[PDB]
Design an enzyme around this catalytic site. Structure first.
Site, PDB file in Angstrom:
ATOM      1  N   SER A   1      -0.153  -2.548 -13.072  1.00  0.00           N
ATOM      2  CA  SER A   1       0.206  -3.900 -12.613  1.00  0.00           C
ATOM      3  C   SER A   1       0.458  -3.938 -11.105  1.00  0.00           C
ATOM      4  CB  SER A   1       1.459  -4.394 -13.347  1.00  0.00           C
ATOM      5  OG  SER A   1       1.668  -5.762 -12.962  1.00  0.00           O
TER       6      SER A   1
ATOM      7  N   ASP B   1       7.926  18.892  -9.793  1.00  0.00           N
ATOM      8  CA  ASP B   1       8.459  20.059  -9.066  1.00  0.00           C
ATOM      9  C   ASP B   1       8.093  19.984  -7.604  1.00  0.00           C
ATOM     10  OD1 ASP B   1       5.735  20.451  -9.065  1.00  0.00           O
ATOM     11  OD2 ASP B   1       5.805  22.469  -9.988  1.00  0.00           O
TER      12      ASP B   1
ATOM     13  N   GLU C   1       0.821  -1.213   0.000  1.00  0.00           N
ATOM     14  CA  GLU C   1       0.000   0.000   0.000  1.00  0.00           C
ATOM     15  C   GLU C   1       0.857   1.265   0.000  1.00  0.00           C
ATOM     16  OE1 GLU C   1      -2.922   2.407  -0.485  1.00  0.00           O
ATOM     17  OE2 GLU C   1      -3.408   0.302  -0.198  1.00  0.00           O
TER      18      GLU C   1
ATOM     19  N   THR D   1       3.258  -7.456  -7.630  1.00  0.00           N
ATOM     20  CA  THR D   1       4.232  -7.971  -8.587  1.00  0.00           C
ATOM     21  C   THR D   1       4.200  -7.161  -9.869  1.00  0.00           C
ATOM     22  OG1 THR D   1       3.694 -10.228  -7.801  1.00  0.00           O
ATOM     23  CG2 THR D   1       4.936  -9.997  -9.880  1.00  0.00           C
TER      24      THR D   1
ATOM     25  N   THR E   1      -2.253  -9.620  -9.331  1.00  0.00           N
ATOM     26  CA  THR E   1      -0.943  -9.656  -8.681  1.00  0.00           C
ATOM     27  C   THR E   1      -0.452  -8.217  -8.415  1.00  0.00           C
ATOM     28  OG1 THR E   1       0.150  -9.680 -10.846  1.00  0.00           O
ATOM     29  CG2 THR E   1      -0.362 -11.798  -9.885  1.00  0.00           C
TER      30      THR E   1
ATOM     31  N   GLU F   1       0.979   3.998  -3.110  1.00  0.00           N
ATOM     32  CA  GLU F   1       0.562   5.413  -2.994  1.00  0.00           C
ATOM     33  C   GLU F   1       1.642   6.376  -3.446  1.00  0.00           C
ATOM     34  OE1 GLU F   1      -1.838   6.467   0.258  1.00  0.00           O
ATOM     35  OE2 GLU F   1      -3.266   5.118  -0.660  1.00  0.00           O
TER      36      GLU F   1
ATOM     37  N   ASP G   1       4.357  -7.427 -13.088  1.00  0.00           N
ATOM     38  CA  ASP G   1       4.267  -8.351 -14.200  1.00  0.00           C
ATOM     39  C   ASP G   1       3.292  -7.887 -15.260  1.00  0.00           C
ATOM     40  OD1 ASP G   1       1.855  -8.618 -12.975  1.00  0.00           O
ATOM     41  OD2 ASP G   1       2.158 -10.673 -12.284  1.00  0.00           O
TER      42      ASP G   1
ATOM     43  N   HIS H   1       1.188  11.965 -10.364  1.00  0.00           N
ATOM     44  CA  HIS H   1       0.340  13.157 -10.233  1.00  0.00           C
ATOM     45  C   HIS H   1       1.224  14.397 -10.022  1.00  0.00           C
ATOM     46  CE1 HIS H   1      -3.901  11.262  -9.434  1.00  0.00           C
ATOM     47  NE2 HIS H   1      -3.118  10.352  -9.983  1.00  0.00           N
TER      48      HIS H   1
ATOM     49  N   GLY I   1       5.272  20.765 -13.485  1.00  0.00           N
ATOM     50  CA  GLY I   1       5.644  19.353 -13.705  1.00  0.00           C
ATOM     51  C   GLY I   1       6.219  18.696 -12.459  1.00  0.00           C
TER      52      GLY I   1
HETATM   53  C1  HEM Z   1      -4.932   7.447 -18.096  1.00  0.00           C
HETATM   54  C2  HEM Z   1      -4.036   7.500 -16.948  1.00  0.00           C
HETATM   55  C3  HEM Z   1      -4.362   7.046 -15.679  1.00  0.00           C
HETATM   56  C4  HEM Z   1      -5.549   7.087 -15.024  1.00  0.00           C
HETATM   57  C5  HEM Z   1      -6.864   7.746 -15.439  1.00  0.00           C
HETATM   58  C6  HEM Z   1      -5.338   6.460 -13.740  1.00  0.00           C
HETATM   59  C7  HEM Z   1      -6.356   6.259 -12.804  1.00  0.00           C
HETATM   60  C8  HEM Z   1      -6.187   5.692 -11.544  1.00  0.00           C
HETATM   61  C9  HEM Z   1      -7.248   5.501 -10.581  1.00  0.00           C
HETATM   62  C10 HEM Z   1      -8.657   6.097 -10.654  1.00  0.00           C
HETATM   63  C11 HEM Z   1      -6.673   4.949  -9.481  1.00  0.00           C
HETATM   64  C12 HEM Z   1      -7.417   4.649  -8.199  1.00  0.00           C
HETATM   65  C13 HEM Z   1      -7.216   5.640  -7.058  1.00  0.00           C
HETATM   66  C14 HEM Z   1      -8.145   5.342  -5.887  1.00  0.00           C
HETATM   67  O1  HEM Z   1      -9.369   5.466  -6.046  1.00  0.00           O
HETATM   68  O2  HEM Z   1      -7.619   4.977  -4.804  1.00  0.00           O
HETATM   69  C15 HEM Z   1      -5.273   4.733  -9.769  1.00  0.00           C
HETATM   70  C16 HEM Z   1      -4.344   4.093  -8.943  1.00  0.00           C
HETATM   71  C17 HEM Z   1      -2.989   3.970  -9.194  1.00  0.00           C
HETATM   72  N1  HEM Z   1      -2.333   4.445 -10.314  1.00  0.00           N
HETATM   73 FE1  HEM Z   1      -3.190   5.204 -11.971  1.00  0.00          FE
HETATM   74  N2  HEM Z   1      -4.000   6.195 -13.566  1.00  0.00           N
HETATM   75  C18 HEM Z   1      -3.389   6.475 -14.765  1.00  0.00           C
HETATM   76  C19 HEM Z   1      -2.012   6.598 -14.910  1.00  0.00           C
HETATM   77  C20 HEM Z   1      -1.075   6.177 -13.969  1.00  0.00           C
HETATM   78  C21 HEM Z   1       0.359   6.198 -14.156  1.00  0.00           C
HETATM   79  C22 HEM Z   1       1.064   6.786 -15.373  1.00  0.00           C
HETATM   80  C23 HEM Z   1       0.924   5.750 -13.010  1.00  0.00           C
HETATM   81  C24 HEM Z   1       2.251   5.727 -12.608  1.00  0.00           C
HETATM   82  C25 HEM Z   1       3.484   5.749 -13.355  1.00  0.00           C
HETATM   83  C26 HEM Z   1      -0.158   5.376 -12.128  1.00  0.00           C
HETATM   84  C27 HEM Z   1       0.022   4.681 -10.924  1.00  0.00           C
HETATM   85  C28 HEM Z   1      -0.997   4.145 -10.151  1.00  0.00           C
HETATM   86  C29 HEM Z   1      -0.803   3.467  -8.887  1.00  0.00           C
HETATM   87  C30 HEM Z   1       0.514   2.905  -8.366  1.00  0.00           C
HETATM   88  C31 HEM Z   1      -2.028   3.315  -8.336  1.00  0.00           C
HETATM   89  C32 HEM Z   1      -2.326   2.640  -7.009  1.00  0.00           C
HETATM   90  C33 HEM Z   1      -2.289   3.561  -5.788  1.00  0.00           C
HETATM   91  C34 HEM Z   1      -2.791   2.771  -4.580  1.00  0.00           C
HETATM   92  O3  HEM Z   1      -2.906   1.527  -4.699  1.00  0.00           O
HETATM   93  O4  HEM Z   1      -3.021   3.419  -3.553  1.00  0.00           O
HETATM   94  N3  HEM Z   1      -1.367   5.598 -12.755  1.00  0.00           N
HETATM   95  N4  HEM Z   1      -5.008   5.169 -11.057  1.00  0.00           N
HETATM   96 CA   LIG Z   2       0.657  -7.280 -11.291  1.00  0.00          CA
HETATM   97 CA   LIG Z   3       3.811  19.045  -9.723  1.00  0.00          CA
HETATM   98 SM   LIG Z   4      -4.570   3.571  -1.897  1.00  0.00          SM
END
Ligand code: HEM
Ligand SMILES: [Ca+2]
Ligand SMILES: [Ca+2]
Ligand SMILES: [Sm+3]
Ligand SMILES: *[C@@H]1O[C@H](CO)[C@@H](O[C@@H]2O[C@H](CO)[C@@H](O)[C@H](O)[C@H]2NC(C)=O)[C@H](O)[C@H]1NC(C)=O
Ligand SMILES: *[C@H]1O[C@H](CO)[C@@H](O)[C@H](O)[C@@H]1O
Length: 357
Positions: free
Chosen positions: A174, A64, A35, A196, A193, A39, A198, A46, A62
């Site tokens: 993933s 920053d 977790e 992981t 997973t 995050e 993958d 972001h 960006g």
């Molecule tokens: C079209 C682009 C993307 C969209 C719309 C998107 C959308 C989302 C959404 C809605 C969540 C759920 C957040 C929640 O409700 O807790 C999420 C989680 C996550 N996203 Fe994305 N994301 C995208 C791009 C990315 C990119 C480029 C990365 C990182 C290089 C990223 C990394 C992750 C990670 C690691 C989580 C999990 C965070 C957690 O488990 O607390 N996402 N994303």
């Molecule tokens: Ca995975």
């Molecule tokens: Ca920024």
């Molecule tokens: Sm979370």
């Protein structure tokens, strides 16, 4: 240079990142892809993507550190819902490791977190981003209800990303879970997973959905192929955006291209993160501190597989010019629960600091 602890590194300026890595691992990640790692990895994206070529510098700087420096502005935008805990976890590091800028802290912490996810690449890490910026404006973060046109445009406007690079970056899903898309359930993973790094997410998003892990009509969510959950082991969630990307003519073949192609996925993710981590900067002005990024946990090397309860008959394919690979299926008549916890349990609450965000 030789750092106080005896490590020989490329540049003296990189020495401070060694005790920062150790502190991040001891305090919030515990060397797990769990977790708190998840995050922080979302925070790296972001922080970095809030920049706009067309709107000019006033819209955002960006990568920053604006999320840490202005903790009450961007984390409160609705597209940033849930980003607050990661900002509050990193601010104490910004204050203690006070020779490292907030911007560099955010990117480095993302690299360290990713290193704990088996199969992840060892990200490039350049250092030297300044410690002063502005708060970004709203509307710069992609949202799961957005169309592929909207998403590809946001990424092109932010940093010239190509659709290949955009789908490459989504390999992060993933190792990703959702807490806010459906308020009735916590930590719904995007693949089976989530600890992981993958290629399962690319495979599983292409299966026919059969239900929802929580309720059935949340914005930005579509039906899941593996919706079964029990206790803290929440079923898989599918985002509309990931689904749309997997099926759109612009991106479908790239999406399929990563199924069962671990090293290709990992190397492509690395190249796109190299670009993402320096948005708002000239990379020729940052010094290379890649040698102080921890070495990642290696994958096992096993091919992708259909989770039990699924098979090739469940595929919804969209790439006419590339052969879908031949994969085996995990035995069993019905879906296995996806573990809430990295060691397979259900009881592993992550360290969380209170803070201004
Ligand atoms: C079209 C682009 C993307 C969209 C719309 C998107 C959308 C989302 C959404 C809605 C969540 C759920 C957040 C929640 O409700 O807790 C999420 C989680 C996550 N996203 Fe994305 N994301 C995208 C791009 C990315 C990119 C480029 C990365 C990182 C290089 C990223 C990394 C992750 C990670 C690691 C989580 C999990 C965070 C957690 O488990 O607390 N996402 N994303
Ligand atoms: Ca995975
Ligand atoms: Ca920024
Ligand atoms: Sm979370
Ligand atoms: C970057 O900016 C932050 C915010 O101005 C600085 O954080 C302060 O750091 C000192 C210790 O150096 C603490 O006493 C303050 O509480 C922190 N301020 C806040 C608002 O949290 C940080 O030191 C700066 N880092 C660098 C490398 O210049
Ligand atoms: C995971 O669990 C499912 C049942 O929930 C099995 O069918 C599968 O074989 C695996 O053990």
């Amino acid at each position: 240079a030789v750092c106080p602890d005896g490590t020989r590194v490329s540049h003296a300026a990189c020495c401070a990142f060694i005790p920062l890595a150790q502190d991040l691992q001891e305090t919030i990640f515990q060397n797990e892809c769990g977790e708190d790692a998840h995050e922080v990895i979302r925070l790296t994206f972001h922080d970095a993507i809030a920049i706009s070529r067309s709107q000019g510098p006033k819209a955002g700087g960006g990568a920053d550190g604006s999320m840490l420096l202005f903790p009450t502005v961007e984390p409160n935008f609705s597209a940033n819902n849930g980003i607050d805990d990661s900002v509050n976890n990193l601010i104490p590091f910004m204050q203690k490791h006070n020779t490292i800028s907030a911007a560099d802290l955010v990117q480095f912490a993302g690299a360290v977190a990713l290193s704990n996810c088996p199969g992840a690449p060892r990200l490039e890490f350049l250092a030297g981003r300044p410690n002063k910026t502005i708060a970004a404006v709203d509307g710069l973060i992609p949202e799961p209800q957005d169309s592929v046109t909207k998403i590809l445009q946001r990424f092109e406007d932010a940093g010239g990303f190509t659709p290949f690079e955009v789908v490459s970056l989504l390999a992060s899903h993933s190792v990703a879970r959702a807490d806010k898309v459906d308020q009735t359930i916590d930590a719904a993973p995007f693949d089976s997973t989530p600890f992981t790094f993958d290629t399962q997410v690319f495979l599983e998003v292409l299966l026919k959905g059969v239900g929802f892990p929580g309720s059935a009509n949340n914005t930005g969510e579509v039906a899941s192929p593996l919706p079964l959950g029990s206790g803290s082991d929440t079923g898989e969630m599918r985002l509309q955006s990931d689904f749309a990307l997997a099926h759109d003519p612009r991106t479908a073949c790239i999406w399929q291209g990563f199924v069962n192609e671990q090293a290709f996925m990992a190397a492509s993710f690395r190249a796109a993160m190299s670009k993402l981590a320096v948005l708002g900067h000239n990379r020729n002005s940052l010094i290379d501190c890649s040698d102080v990024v921890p070495v990642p946990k290696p994958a096992t090397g096993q091919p992708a597989m259909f989770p039990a309860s699924t098979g090739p008959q469940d595929l919804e394919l969209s790439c006419p010019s590339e052969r879908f690979p031949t994969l085996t299926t995990q035995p069993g008549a019905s879906q296995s629960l996806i573990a809430h916890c990295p060691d397979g349990s259900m009881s592993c609450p992550g360290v969380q600091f209170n803070g201004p965000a």
